[PDB]
Design a protein around this ligand. Structure first.
Ligand SMILES: Nc1ncnc2c1ncn2[C@@H]1O[C@H](COP(=O)(O)OP(=O)(O)O)[C@@H](O)[C@H]1O
Ligand SMILES: Nc1ncnc2c1ncn2[C@@H]1O[C@H](COP(=O)(O)OP(=O)(O)O)[C@@H](O)[C@H]1O
Ligand SMILES: [K+]
Ligand SMILES: [K+]
Ligand SMILES: [Mg+2]
Ligand SMILES: [Mg+2]
Ligand SMILES: [Mg+2]
Ligand SMILES: [Mg+2]
Lengths: 322, 324
């Protein structure tokens, strides 16, 4: 059984994805080759990918897409890319057309969970509590019916890139300008403050199994990029110090969202807790596997060891593809 | 300006796709090469693609994906691939990775508009009237809160394939079994009976312009596959006989849905009319271009001739990929 693991990517989460690949490669129990997508979109294979892994960033690649890769030599593809062009259904569409089993969410689930506006519309209709928000298109003025503080985001982002906590209505124009450098659509959400951030891992095809609930504790004004990936800046509380009824509701809501969106393989489902009210923040279908990442730690605490977790992901890929 | 037209596909709408390619190739005002995805997922190129188009079906292809062709030579790709894998975001995702402009909706809008459950969830959330429905997954006990008559559908279908009109609870099991031959998820909708069917074309990126409203009438119990593609079976009324307030309301609803879903390039937006009561039925991001298809006729009535409609689709693809 040969696995092809793809990491890097052209999204702002390129470096995060190479850290994820280091984590997965340390534990995956199958023979596994790495393929790296550089920041310019060109791929690196063989020894050049392993070199780029060691540098933790590859700004330039060798082969334009699609790469001269002998796909038939691999049984499963593990797309370990985060964000645009990797977690959003693009890579998944390519792999579906390749006819190759692959780890994680299909095209629709991936595209929808990446879009913070569309996912919120689906989940809100399904009865899942979400934060008040509006969508904003580039070149169009925002119509924000709620009062600040706000969070402003590109609709398709990850690792808090392009996100701003906005406290003045006057700072909203600059915040949207920054958001529009990453996407043609943005979301303005009502900021919850104070807020506790809860995350729960799901594993399985449509009908999921939930991990224990974890909590993110930090000092920064929000869980920003620097706080997410700088060692020691975030404390992951596993399991979270959470009252029993809320813990139960987090797991029920995560599994319901997972099923409604038809997610396969895995997701990390993230929630806000403010004044005793739960809100589903987002699903992430390719969660990070970095040394500061929550998803593998959550399942390790729930009795699913890191090599067992990757085995299940690979086996869920084979099972769905039949 | 060179176009690569892709048609065929592995979905049940493979033959309809080849018919649409015949119509687009007749009028497209650009040099256009044809690639055909055969029903087995292997591709046909060059002379074999044109031969297969003449045969109107291609069960067996030659080239495993990804096909041996230079994508760099094409300025735009026009996926004319109805249904699963072609209209549902899959081919769009591959084309995004090529860095290639392409006609029509992107990955998320394509995936949403092909799923009859998730599109309805988004549209209902935005306040768009839609028929009562539930989603049923394979192996799950169907929990339907309303009484029959039902319409049962594969969640990802087109051209009415796998759809049953269900009059009695006893007939629900056979209808779900039929729907589950095509998808792992199905929808059960409350049937409207009788009902008029309205369709409106949209053109543009996110902020579209609507064609005149057309209406489809027919003798069959519903707008089934045979009625859709038998010459003369379907009556296509353009403009629809509606009072002007209703016409504007249909066009505004189609543009609202188009914008909420983030559709690009084009869509045909289809509605039900039940003694004045309006429901959005579905959006189709790759509508048909067959000799009995509504989308080109609708924009024809709106003063956009067939070659100009196809030009604008290619122009809209270039305007989105570059610049945005
Ligand atoms: N509505 C909100 N209220 C409070 N904090 C928020 C809100 N939205 C985002 N944040 C903060 O920003 C972080 C990143 O937001 P998120 O939507 O998860 O984007 P990403 O997918 O990039 O992580 C969250 O973990 C949280 O710290
Ligand atoms: N809820 C409904 N009530 C009445 N007729 C329906 C309903 N749903 C579908 N139909 C009939 O079936 C046809 C096909 O259904 P539709 O959802 O548009 O699927 P497709 O994408 O296969 O065309 C419709 O044009 C209409 O004639
Ligand atoms: K996400
Ligand atoms: K559709
Ligand atoms: Mg995220
Ligand atoms: Mg997040
Ligand atoms: Mg349809
Ligand atoms: Mg239809």
């Amino acid at each position: 059984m040969r696995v092809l693991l793809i990491a890097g990517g052209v999204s702002p989460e390129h470096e995060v994805s190479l850290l994820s690949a280091e984590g997965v490669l340390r534990h995956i129990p199958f023979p596994t080759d790495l393929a790296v997508i550089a920041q310019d979109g060109r791929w690196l294979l063989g020894e050049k990918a392993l070199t780029a892994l060691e540098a933790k960033a590859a700004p330039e690649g060798e082969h334009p897409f699609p790469p001269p890769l002998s796909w038939e030599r691999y049984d499963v593809v593990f797309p370990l890319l985060h964000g645009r062009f990797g977690e959003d259904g693009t890579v998944q569409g390519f792999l579906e057309l390749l006819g190759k089993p692959y780890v994680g969410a299909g095209v629709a689930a991936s595209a929808l969970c990446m879009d913070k506006d569309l996912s919120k519309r689906v989940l809100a209709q399904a009865g899942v509590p979400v934060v008040p928000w509006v969508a904003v298109r580039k070149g169009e003025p925002p119509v924000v019916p709620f009062d600040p503080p706000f969070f402003v985001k590109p609709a398709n982002t990850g690792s808090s890139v392009g996100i701003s906590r906005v406290e003045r209505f006057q700072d909203l124009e600059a915040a949207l300008a920054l958001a529009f450098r990453y996407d043609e659509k943005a979301v303005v959400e009502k900021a919850l403050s104070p807020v506790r951030e809860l995350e729960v891992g799901v594993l399985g095809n449509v009908f999921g199994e939930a991990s224990p609930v974890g909590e993110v504790r930090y000092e920064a004004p929000f869980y920003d990029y620097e706080t997410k990936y700088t060692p020691g800046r975030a404390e992951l509380l596993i399991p979270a110090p959470l009252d029993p009824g809320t813990q139960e509701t987090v797991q029920e809501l995560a599994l319901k969202a997972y099923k409604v969106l038809g997610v396969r393989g895995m997701a990390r489902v993230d929630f806000f807790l403010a004044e005793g009210e739960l809100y589903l923040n987002e699903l992430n279908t390719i969660p990070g596997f970095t040394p500061t990442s929550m998803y593998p730690r959550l399942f390790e605490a729930g009795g699913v060891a890191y090599p067992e977790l990757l085995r299940r992901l690979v086996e869920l890929a084979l099972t769905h593809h039949h």
